[PDB]
Coordinates of C-alpha atoms in Angstrom, one line a residue:
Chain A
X1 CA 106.2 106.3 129.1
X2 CA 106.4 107.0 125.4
X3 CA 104.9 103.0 124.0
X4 CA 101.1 103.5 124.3
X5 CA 101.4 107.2 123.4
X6 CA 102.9 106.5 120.2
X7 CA 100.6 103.9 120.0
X8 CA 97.2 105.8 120.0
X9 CA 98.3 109.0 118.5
X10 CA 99.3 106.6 115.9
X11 CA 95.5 105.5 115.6
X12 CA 93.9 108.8 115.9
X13 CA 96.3 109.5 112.5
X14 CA 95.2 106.5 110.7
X15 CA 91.3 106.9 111.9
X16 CA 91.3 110.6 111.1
X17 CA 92.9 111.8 108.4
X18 CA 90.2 114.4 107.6
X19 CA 91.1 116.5 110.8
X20 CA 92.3 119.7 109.5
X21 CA 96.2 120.2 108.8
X22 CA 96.1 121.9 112.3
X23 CA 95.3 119.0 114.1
X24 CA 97.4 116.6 111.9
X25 CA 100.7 119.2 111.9
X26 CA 100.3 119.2 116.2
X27 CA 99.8 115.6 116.4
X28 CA 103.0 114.9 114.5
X29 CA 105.0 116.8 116.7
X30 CA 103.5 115.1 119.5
X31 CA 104.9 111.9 117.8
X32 CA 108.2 113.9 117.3
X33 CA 108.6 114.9 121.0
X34 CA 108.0 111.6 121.9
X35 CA 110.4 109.7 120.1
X36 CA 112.9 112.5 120.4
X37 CA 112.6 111.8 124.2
X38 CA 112.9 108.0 123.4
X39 CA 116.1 108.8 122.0
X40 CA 117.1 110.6 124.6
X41 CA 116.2 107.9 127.5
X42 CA 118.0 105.6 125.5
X43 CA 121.0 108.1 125.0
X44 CA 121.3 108.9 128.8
X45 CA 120.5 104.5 130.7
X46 CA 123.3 102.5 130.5
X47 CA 121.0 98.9 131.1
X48 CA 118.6 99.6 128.8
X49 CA 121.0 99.9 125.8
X50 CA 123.1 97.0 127.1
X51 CA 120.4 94.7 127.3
X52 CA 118.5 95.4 123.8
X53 CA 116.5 92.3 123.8
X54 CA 118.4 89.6 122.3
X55 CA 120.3 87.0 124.1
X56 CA 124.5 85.7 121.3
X57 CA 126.1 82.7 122.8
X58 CA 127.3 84.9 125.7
X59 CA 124.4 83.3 128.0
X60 CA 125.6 79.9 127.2
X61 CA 129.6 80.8 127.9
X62 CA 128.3 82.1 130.7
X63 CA 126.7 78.7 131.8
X64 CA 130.1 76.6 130.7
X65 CA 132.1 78.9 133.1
X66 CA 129.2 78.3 135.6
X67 CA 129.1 74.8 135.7
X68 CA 132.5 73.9 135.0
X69 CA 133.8 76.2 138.1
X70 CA 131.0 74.7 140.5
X71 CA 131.7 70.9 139.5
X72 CA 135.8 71.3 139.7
X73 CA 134.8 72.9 143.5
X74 CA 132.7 69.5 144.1
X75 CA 135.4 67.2 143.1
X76 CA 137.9 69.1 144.8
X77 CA 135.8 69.7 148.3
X78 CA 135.4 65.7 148.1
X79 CA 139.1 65.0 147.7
X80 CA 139.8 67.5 150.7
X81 CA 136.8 65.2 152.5
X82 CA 138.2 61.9 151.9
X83 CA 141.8 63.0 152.8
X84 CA 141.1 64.8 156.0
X85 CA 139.0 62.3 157.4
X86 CA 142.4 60.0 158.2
Chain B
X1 CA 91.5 111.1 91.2
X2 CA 92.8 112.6 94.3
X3 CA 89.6 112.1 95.8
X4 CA 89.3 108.7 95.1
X5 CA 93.2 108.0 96.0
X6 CA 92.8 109.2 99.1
X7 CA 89.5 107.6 99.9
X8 CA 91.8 104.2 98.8
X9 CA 94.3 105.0 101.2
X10 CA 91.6 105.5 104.6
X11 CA 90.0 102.5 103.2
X12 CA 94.0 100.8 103.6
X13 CA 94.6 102.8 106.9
X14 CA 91.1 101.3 108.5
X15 CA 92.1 98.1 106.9
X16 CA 95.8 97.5 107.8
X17 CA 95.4 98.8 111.6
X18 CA 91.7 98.4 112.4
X19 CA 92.7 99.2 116.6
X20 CA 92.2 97.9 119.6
X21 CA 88.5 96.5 121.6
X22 CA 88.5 100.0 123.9
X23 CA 85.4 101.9 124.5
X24 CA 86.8 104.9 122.8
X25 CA 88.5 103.2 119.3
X26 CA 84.5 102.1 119.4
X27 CA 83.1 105.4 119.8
X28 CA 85.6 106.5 117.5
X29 CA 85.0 104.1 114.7
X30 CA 81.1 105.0 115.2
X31 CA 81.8 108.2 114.8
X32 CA 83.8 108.2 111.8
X33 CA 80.6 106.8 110.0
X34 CA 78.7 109.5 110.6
X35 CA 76.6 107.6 113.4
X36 CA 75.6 109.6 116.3
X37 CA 77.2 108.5 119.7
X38 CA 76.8 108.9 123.2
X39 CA 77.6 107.4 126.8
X40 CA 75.6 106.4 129.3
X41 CA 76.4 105.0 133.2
X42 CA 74.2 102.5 134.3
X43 CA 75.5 101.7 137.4
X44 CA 78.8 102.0 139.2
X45 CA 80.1 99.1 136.8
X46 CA 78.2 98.8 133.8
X47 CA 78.5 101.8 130.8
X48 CA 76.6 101.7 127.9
X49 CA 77.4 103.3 124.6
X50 CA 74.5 104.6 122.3
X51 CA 74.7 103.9 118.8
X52 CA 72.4 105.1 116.0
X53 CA 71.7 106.7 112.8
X54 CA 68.5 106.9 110.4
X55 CA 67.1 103.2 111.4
X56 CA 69.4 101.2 113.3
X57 CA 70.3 101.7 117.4
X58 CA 73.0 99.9 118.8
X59 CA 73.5 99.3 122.6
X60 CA 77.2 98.7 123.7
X61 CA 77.5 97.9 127.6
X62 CA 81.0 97.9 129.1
X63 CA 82.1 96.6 132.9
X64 CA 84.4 99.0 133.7
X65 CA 85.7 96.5 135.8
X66 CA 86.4 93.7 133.7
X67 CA 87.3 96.2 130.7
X68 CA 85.0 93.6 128.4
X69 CA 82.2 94.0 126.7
X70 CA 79.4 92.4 128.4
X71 CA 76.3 92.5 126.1
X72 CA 75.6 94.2 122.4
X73 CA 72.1 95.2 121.4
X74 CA 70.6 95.7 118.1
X75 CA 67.3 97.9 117.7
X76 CA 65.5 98.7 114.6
X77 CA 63.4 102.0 114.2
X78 CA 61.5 100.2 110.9
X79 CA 58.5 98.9 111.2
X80 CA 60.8 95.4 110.7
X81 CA 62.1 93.9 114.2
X82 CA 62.9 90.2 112.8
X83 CA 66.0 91.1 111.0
X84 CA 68.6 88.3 112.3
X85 CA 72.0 89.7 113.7
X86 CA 73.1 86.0 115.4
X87 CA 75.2 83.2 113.8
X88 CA 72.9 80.4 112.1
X89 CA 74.8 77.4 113.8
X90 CA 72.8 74.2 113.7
X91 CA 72.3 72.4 117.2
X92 CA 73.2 75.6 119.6
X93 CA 70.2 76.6 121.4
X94 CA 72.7 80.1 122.3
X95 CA 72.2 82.1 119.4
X96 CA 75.4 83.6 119.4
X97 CA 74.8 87.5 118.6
X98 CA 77.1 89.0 115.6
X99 CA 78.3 92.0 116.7
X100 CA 79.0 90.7 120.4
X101 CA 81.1 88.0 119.0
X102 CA 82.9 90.4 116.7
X103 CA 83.8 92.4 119.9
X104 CA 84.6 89.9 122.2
X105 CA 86.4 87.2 120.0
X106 CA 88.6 89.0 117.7
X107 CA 91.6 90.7 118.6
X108 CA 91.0 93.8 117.1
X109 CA 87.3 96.1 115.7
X110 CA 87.9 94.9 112.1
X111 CA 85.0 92.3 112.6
X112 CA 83.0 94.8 114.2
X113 CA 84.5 97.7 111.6
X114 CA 82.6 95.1 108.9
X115 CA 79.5 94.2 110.1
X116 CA 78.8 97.7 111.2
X117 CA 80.1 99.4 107.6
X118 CA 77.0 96.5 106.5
X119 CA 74.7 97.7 108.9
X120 CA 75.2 101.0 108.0
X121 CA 75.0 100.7 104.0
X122 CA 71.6 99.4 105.0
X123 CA 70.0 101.9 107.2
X124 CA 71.5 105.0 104.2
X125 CA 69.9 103.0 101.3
X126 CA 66.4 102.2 103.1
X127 CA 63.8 104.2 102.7
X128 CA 60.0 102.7 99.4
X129 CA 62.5 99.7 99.6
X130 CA 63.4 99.0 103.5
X131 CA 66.4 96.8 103.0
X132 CA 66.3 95.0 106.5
X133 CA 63.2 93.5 105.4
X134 CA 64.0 92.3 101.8
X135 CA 68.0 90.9 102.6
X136 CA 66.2 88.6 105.3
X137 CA 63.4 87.6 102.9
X138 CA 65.8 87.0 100.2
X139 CA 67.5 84.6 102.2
X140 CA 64.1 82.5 102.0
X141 CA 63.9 83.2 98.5
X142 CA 66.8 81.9 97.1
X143 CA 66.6 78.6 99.4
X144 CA 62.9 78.3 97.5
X145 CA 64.6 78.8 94.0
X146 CA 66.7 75.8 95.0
X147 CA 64.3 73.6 96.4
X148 CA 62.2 74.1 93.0
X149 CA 65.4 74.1 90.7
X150 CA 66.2 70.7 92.8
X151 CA 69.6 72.5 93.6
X152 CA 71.7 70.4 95.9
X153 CA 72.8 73.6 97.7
X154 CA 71.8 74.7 101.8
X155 CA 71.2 78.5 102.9
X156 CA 72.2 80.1 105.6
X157 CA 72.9 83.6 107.1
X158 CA 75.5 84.5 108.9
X159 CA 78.3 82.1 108.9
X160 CA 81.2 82.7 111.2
X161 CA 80.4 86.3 112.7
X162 CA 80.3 88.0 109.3
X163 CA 76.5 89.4 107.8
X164 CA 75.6 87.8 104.5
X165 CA 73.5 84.9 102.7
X166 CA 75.9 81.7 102.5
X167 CA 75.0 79.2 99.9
X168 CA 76.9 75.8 101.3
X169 CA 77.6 72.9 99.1
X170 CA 78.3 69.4 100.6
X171 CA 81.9 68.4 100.6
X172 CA 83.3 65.1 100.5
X173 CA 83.4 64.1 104.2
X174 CA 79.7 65.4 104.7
X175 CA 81.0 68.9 105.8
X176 CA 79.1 71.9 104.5
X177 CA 81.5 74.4 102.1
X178 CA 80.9 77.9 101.5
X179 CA 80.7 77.9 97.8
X180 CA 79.0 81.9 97.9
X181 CA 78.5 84.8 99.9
X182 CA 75.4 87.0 98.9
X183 CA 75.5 90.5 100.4
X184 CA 74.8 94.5 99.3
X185 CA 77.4 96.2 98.2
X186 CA 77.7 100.3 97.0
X187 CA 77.7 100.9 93.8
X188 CA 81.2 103.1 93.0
X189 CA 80.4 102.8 89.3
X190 CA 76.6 104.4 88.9
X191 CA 74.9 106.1 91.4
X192 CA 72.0 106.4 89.2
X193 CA 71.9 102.6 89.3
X194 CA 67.8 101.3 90.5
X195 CA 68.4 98.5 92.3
X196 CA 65.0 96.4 92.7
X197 CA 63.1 94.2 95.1
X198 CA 62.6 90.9 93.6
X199 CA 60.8 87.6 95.1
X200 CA 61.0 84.2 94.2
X201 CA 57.0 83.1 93.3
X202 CA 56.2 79.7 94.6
X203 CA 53.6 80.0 91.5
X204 CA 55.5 81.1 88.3
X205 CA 58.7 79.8 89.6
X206 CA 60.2 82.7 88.8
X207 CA 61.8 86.0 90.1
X208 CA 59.1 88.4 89.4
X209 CA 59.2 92.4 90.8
X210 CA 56.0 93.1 92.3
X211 CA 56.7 96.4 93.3
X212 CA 58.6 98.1 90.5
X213 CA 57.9 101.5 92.6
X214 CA 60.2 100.0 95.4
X215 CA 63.7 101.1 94.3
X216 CA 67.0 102.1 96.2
X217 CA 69.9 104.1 94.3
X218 CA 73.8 103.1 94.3
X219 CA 73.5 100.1 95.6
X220 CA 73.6 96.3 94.2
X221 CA 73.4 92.7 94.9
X222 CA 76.8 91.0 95.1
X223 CA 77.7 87.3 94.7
X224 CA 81.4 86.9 96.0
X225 CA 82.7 83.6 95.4
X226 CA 84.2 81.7 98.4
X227 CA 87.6 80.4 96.9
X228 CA 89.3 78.0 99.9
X229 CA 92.4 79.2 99.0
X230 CA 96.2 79.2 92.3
X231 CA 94.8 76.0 92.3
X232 CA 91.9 76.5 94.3
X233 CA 90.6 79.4 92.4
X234 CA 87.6 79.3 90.1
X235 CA 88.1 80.0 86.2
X236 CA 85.3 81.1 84.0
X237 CA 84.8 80.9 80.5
X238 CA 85.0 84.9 79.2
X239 CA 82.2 84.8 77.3
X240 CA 80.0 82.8 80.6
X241 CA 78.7 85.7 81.5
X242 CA 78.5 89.2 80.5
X243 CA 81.1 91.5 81.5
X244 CA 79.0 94.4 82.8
X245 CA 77.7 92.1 86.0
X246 CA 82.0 91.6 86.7
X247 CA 82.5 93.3 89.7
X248 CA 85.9 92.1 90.6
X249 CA 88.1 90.4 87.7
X250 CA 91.3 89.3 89.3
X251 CA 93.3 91.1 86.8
X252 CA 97.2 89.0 87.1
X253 CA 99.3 92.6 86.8
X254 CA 101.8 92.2 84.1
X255 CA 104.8 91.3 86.0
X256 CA 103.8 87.3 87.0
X257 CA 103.2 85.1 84.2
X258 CA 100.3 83.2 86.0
X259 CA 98.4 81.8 83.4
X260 CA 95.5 79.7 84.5
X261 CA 97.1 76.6 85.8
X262 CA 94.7 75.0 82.8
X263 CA 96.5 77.1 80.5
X264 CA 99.6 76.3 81.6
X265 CA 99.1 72.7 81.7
X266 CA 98.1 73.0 77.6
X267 CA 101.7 74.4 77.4
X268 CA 104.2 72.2 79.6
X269 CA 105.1 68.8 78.6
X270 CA 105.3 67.1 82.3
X271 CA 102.0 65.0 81.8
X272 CA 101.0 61.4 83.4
X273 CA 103.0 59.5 80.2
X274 CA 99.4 57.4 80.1
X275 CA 97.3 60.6 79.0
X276 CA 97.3 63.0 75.8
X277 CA 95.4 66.4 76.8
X278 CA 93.2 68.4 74.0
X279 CA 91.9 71.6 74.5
X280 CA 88.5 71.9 73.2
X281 CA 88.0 75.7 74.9
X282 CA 87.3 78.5 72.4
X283 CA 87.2 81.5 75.3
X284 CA 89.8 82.7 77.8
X285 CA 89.5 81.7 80.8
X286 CA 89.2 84.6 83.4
X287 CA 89.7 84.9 87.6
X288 CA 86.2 86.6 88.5
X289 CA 85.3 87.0 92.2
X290 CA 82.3 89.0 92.4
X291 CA 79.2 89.3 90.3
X292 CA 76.6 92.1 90.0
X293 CA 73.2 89.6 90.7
X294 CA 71.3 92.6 91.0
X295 CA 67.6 92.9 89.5
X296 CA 66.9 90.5 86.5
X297 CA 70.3 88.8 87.3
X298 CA 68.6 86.7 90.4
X299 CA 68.4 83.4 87.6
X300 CA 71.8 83.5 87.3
X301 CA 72.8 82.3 90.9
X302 CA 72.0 78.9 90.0
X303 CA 74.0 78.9 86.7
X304 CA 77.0 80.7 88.9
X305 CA 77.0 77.9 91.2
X306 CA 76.5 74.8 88.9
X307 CA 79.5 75.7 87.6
X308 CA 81.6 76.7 90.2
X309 CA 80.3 73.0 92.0
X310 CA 81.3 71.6 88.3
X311 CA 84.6 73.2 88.1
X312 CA 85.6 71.9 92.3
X313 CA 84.3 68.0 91.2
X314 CA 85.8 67.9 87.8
X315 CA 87.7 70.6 86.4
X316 CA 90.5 71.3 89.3
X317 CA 90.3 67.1 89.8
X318 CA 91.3 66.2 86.2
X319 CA 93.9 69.0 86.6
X320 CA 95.5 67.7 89.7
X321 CA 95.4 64.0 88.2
X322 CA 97.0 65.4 84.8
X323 CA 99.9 67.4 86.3
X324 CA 101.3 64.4 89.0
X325 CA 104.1 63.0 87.0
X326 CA 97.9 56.7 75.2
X327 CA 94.4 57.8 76.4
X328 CA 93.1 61.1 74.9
X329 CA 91.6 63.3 77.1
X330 CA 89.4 66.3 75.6
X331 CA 88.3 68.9 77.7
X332 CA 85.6 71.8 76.3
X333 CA 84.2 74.4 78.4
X334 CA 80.9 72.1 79.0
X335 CA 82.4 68.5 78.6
X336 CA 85.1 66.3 79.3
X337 CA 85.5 63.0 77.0
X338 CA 88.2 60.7 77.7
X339 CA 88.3 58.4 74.9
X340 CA 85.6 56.4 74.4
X341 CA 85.8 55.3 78.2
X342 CA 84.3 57.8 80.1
X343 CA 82.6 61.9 79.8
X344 CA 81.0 63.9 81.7
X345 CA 79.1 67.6 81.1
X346 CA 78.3 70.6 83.0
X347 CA 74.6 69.6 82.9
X348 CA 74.6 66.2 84.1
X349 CA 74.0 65.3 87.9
X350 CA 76.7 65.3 90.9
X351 CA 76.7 62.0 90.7
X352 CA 77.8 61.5 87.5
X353 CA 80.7 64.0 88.2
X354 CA 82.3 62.3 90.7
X355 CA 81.6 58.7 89.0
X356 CA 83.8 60.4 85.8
X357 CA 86.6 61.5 88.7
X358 CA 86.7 58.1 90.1
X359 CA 87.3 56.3 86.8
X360 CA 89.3 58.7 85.5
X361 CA 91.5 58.3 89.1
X362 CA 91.1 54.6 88.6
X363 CA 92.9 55.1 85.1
X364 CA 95.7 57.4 86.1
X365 CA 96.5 55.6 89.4
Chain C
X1 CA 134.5 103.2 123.3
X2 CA 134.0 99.7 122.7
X3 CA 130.6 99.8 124.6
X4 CA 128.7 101.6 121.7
X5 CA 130.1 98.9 119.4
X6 CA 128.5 96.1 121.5
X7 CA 125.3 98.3 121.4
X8 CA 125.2 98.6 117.9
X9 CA 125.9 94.3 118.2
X10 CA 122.3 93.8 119.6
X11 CA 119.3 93.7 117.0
X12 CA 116.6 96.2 118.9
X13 CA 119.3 99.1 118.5
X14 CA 119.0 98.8 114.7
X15 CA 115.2 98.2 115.4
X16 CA 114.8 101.4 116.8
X17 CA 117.6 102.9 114.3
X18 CA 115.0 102.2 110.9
X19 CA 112.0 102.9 113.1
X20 CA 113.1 106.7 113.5
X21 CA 114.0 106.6 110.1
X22 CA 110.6 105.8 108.9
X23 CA 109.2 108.3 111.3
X24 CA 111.8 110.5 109.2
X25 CA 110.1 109.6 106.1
X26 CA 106.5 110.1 107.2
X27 CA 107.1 113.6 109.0
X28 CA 108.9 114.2 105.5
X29 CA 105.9 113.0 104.0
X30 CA 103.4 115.0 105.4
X31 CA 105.5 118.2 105.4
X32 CA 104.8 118.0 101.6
X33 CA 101.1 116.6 102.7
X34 CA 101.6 113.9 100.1
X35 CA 101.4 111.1 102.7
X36 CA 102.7 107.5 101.2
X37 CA 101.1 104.1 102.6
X38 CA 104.5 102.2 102.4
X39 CA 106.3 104.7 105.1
X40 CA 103.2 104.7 107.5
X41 CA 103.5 100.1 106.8
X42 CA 106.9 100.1 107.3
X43 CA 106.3 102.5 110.5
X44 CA 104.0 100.2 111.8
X45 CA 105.8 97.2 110.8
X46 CA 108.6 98.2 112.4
X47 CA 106.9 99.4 115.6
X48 CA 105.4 96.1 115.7
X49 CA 109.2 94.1 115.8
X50 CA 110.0 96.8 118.2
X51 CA 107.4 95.2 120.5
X52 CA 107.9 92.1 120.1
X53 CA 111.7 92.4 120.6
X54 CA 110.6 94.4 123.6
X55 CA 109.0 90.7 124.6
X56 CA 112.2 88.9 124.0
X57 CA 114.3 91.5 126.1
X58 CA 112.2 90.2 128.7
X59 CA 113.0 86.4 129.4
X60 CA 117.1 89.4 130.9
X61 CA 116.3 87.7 134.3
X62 CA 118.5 84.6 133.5
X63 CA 121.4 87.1 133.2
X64 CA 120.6 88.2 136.3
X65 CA 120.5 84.8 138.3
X66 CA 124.0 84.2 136.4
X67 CA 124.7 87.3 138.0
X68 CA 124.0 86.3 140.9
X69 CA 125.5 83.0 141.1
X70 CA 128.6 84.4 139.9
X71 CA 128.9 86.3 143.3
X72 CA 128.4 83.2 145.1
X73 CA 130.8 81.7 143.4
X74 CA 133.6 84.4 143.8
X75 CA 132.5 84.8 147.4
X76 CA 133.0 81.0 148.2
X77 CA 136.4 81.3 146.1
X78 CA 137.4 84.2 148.4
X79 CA 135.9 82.2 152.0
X80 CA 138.3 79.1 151.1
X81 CA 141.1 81.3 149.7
X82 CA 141.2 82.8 153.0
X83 CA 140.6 78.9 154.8

C-alpha cells in the first residue's frame, strides 16, 4: 500500500513546515520511495495498467456482440424446435 | 517579508487541506497552537484527549470502536463558567455544542481548526480584561443598543457551528439574514494597539468605558459583513467611513475591469427605454468587508448596518430593475428621487424603502 | 507493442504521468527550499482525480461478467458445434 501513506506524510508536510530540514529532507524521500515503488507496481501488473479506470465504447461493442450472438442462437434453437418436432 | 510570506503560505497549507476527523490530525492540530496535549483511556472503548492552555481545557472522548467522536467538553479556568460554546437555534431544547458539531458534521477539522484558532486568540489576550466574559456580555450589549436605537435588527451567537455575535435582519419571506458577524480578531498591523472594554449604559444610552485600566494588546473588534453571495456585494461611499477602521478593502487587482456594477451601469447604454439614470454620488464607491469597531467605534455598528439594510432594499433593487432590458431617476449616496413620483433616503424607515421599491417596480414592469 | 499504446489510451495513466511530474516539481522545489504553493495545489489536485478515477476504475466488474458470459457463449457454440 503506497495511497494512505502518501496521503498522511502529505499532511504532516503541510501541518509542519517548521520541522527542521532534517525532518522535511527524510520525509520527502519517504514520498520519493513511495511513488518510485508505485511506478514500479504499475511497471511490473499487467491488469492494473489495462484497466486504468475508465470505461471507451468498447463496453458497449462488447454488449452489441453479446446480445446479438445470444438472440441469433434463440431464433435459431426455435427454428431447429419447430422443425424437429414433425 | 520572508517571515510573513511564509507565515501566508501555512496559513494557505492549513487552509487548502485542513485533514481528516482522526484522533491524531486532532492532537496534531492542537499541538501546532502551542496547546498542551495528552491522552487518556477511560475504559476499554472510550479515549479521551486533553486539551488546554492558559484558560481554556478541552475534553475530546473517542470510541475506539465506532472511530467517532462521542462527546466534546469545554472547561474554563477563569473565574467565568457561562461563556456559551452551543448553537443559538430557536425552538431546540438540544443545545447543540460547537466544537462537537464541528467534529462530527464536517468532513474535514477546518470547522474545528476555526473555532479552536477563536478559542485560542481568547485565552492569549485574557488576562485585567478576561475576554470570555466581555464577548458574551457584548452580545447583550449590542442587542440593548438596538432595542434603544429602535433598530429592527435580532442578536444572536453562534449561528451555524461558527463562534461570533450575528446581527440578523428580517428578509422578505420572514426568514432571518445574516447581515454581520462581530468577532476578535489579531491585530497584524499594531501590536501596541489598546483594545478596550466598553458597555452599552441602559442610563446614558451610550457606550461608555468604565474601566479604562482593563486593556488587552494586539487585538480588535471586527465587523465582517455577510455578503450572500458582484451583485450581491455591498458598496460604500469612500468617504462613509474613515479608512483607518478598513480592515479588508476588496481591492479588484488590475487585470478585471469590475467596476461597481453601479458604475458600470452610469457607463452602458442598455437601460429600461422608460428610465433616464443621473448620478448624484460625489465619492467612489469602494468593496469593504471588515471594519475595525474597536473602542470608540461601538456607535458605528448601527450606521454600518442601516446602510448595508439600505443598500439590500433599495440600492441593489433599483439596479436590478434599471439593468433588465422618460422618467428621471437620480440617485445620491443618501437619496433616490424619481421624478416627482416617488424618493426615498437613507434615514427614513424600512417601510418606506420597500414602498419606494414597489412603486418604482410598479413603473418599470 | 501495441499494448503500451492502449495504456497510454486510458485517462488514469496520464493521471498518474502529471502527478509524478508535480511531485518532480515539489522535490525540485524544496531542493532549493523555496517551496511554491501552486506545485504542492496541483499535487494535491491531482492526487485528488487520481482518487476519484481510482473510484471509477471500480464499477471493472461489468467487464468481468462480459467476461464471463463470453465463455458461455463460446462454450455453448463449441457443445452444438460438436451436436
Amino acid at each position: 500500500e503506497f495511497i494512505p501513506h502518501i496521503f498522511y506524510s502529505l499532511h504532516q508536510i503541510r501541518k509542519d513546515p517548521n520541522n527542521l530540514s532534517n525532518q522535511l529532507e527524510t520525509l520527502t524521500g519517504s514520498i520519493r520511495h513511495r511513488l518510485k515503488l508505485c511506478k514500479s507496481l504499475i511497471s511490473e501488473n499487467e491488469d492494473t495498467k489495462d484497466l486504468l479506470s475508465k470505461s471507451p465504447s468498447e463496453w458497449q461493442d462488447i454488449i452489441h456482440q453479446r446480445e446479438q450472438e445470444l438472440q441469433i442462437k434463440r431464433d435459431v434453437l426455435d427454428d431447429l424446435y419447430r422443425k424437429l418436432q414433425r | 517579508s520572508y517571515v510573513e510570506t511564509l507565515d501566508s503560505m501555512i496559513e494557505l497549507f492549513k487552509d487548502y487541506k485542513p485533514g481528516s476527523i482522526t484522533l491524531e490530525n486532532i492532537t496534531r492540530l492542537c499541538q501546532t497552537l502551542g496547546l498542551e496535549s495528552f491522552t487518556e483511556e477511560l475504559s476499554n472503548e472510550l479515549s479521551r484527549l486533553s486539551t488546554a492552555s492558559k484558560i481554556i481545557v478541552i475534553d475530546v472522548d473517542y470510541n475506539k470502536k465506532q472511530d467517532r467522536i462521542q462527546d466534546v467538553k469545554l472547561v474554563l479556568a477563569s473565574n467565568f463558567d457561562n461563556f456559551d460554546y452551543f448553537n443559538q437555534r430557536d425552538g431546540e431544547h438540544e443545545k447543540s455544542n460547537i466544537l462537537l458539531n464541528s467534529l462530527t458534521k464536517y468532513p474535514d477539522l477546518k470547522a474545528f481548526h476555526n473555532n479552536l484558532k477563536f478559542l485560542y486568540l481568547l485565552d492569549a489576550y485574557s488576562h485585567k480584561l478576561d475576554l470570555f466574559k466581555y464577548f458574551t456580555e457584548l452580545s447583550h450589549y449590542i442587542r440593548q443598543c438596538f432595542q434603544d436605537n429602535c433598530c429592527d435588527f435580532k442578536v444572536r451567537t453562534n449561528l451555524n457551528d461558527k463562534f461570533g455575535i450575528y446581527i440578523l435582519t428580517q428578509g422578505i419571506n420572514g426568514k432571518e439574514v445574516p447581515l454581520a458577524k462581530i468577532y476578535l480578531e489579531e491585530n497584524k498591523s499594531d501590536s501596541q494597539y489598546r483594545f478596550y472594554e466598553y458597555i452599552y449604559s441602559q442610563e446614558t444610552k451610550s457606550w461608555i468605558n468604565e474601566s479604562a485600566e482593563n486593556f488587552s494588546n494586539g487585538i480588535s473588534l471586527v465587523m465582517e459583513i455577510v455578503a450572500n453571495a458582484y451583485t450581491d456585494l455591498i458598496w460604500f461611499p469612500e468617504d462613509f467611513i474613515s479608512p483607518e477602521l478598513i480592515i479588508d478593502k476588496v481591492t479588484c487587482s488590475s487585470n478585471s475591469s469590475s467596476s461597481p456594477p453601479i458604475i458600470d451601469l452610469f457607463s452602458n447604454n442598455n437601460y429600461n427605454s422608460r428610465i433616464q439614470l443621473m448620478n448624484d454620488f460625489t465619492t467612489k464607491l469602494i468593496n469593504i468587508k471588515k471594519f475595525d469597531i474597536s473602542n470608540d467605534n461601538l456607535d458605528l455598528i448601527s450606521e454600518i448596518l442601516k446602510w448595508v439594510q439600505w443598500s439590500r432594499i433599495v440600492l441593489q433593487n433599483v439596479f436590478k430593475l434599471v439593468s433588465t432590458p422618460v422618467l428621471q431617476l437620480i440617485v445620491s449616496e443618501d437619496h433616490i428621487i424619481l421624478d416627482t413620483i416617488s424618493e426615498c433616503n437613507l434615514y427614513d424607515d424600512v417601510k418606506c424603502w420597500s414602498k419606494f421599491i414597489e412603486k418604482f417596480q410598479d413603473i418599470v414592469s | 507493442t501495441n499494448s503500451e499504446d492502449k495504456l497510454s489510451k486510458v485517462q488514469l495513466y496520464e493521471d498518474l504521468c502529471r502527478y509524478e511530474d508535480t511531485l518532480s516539481k515539489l522535490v525540485e522545489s524544496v531542493d532549493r527550499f523555496k517551496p511554491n504553493l501552486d506545485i504542492a495545489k496541483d499535487l494535491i489536485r491531482t492526487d485528488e482525480a487520481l482518487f476519484e478515477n481510482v473510484k471509477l476504475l471500480a464499477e471493472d466488474n461489468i467487464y468481468r461478467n462480459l467476461q464471463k458470459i463470453d465463455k458461455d457463449s463460446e462454450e455453448l457454440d463449441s457443445k452444438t458445434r460438436k451436436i
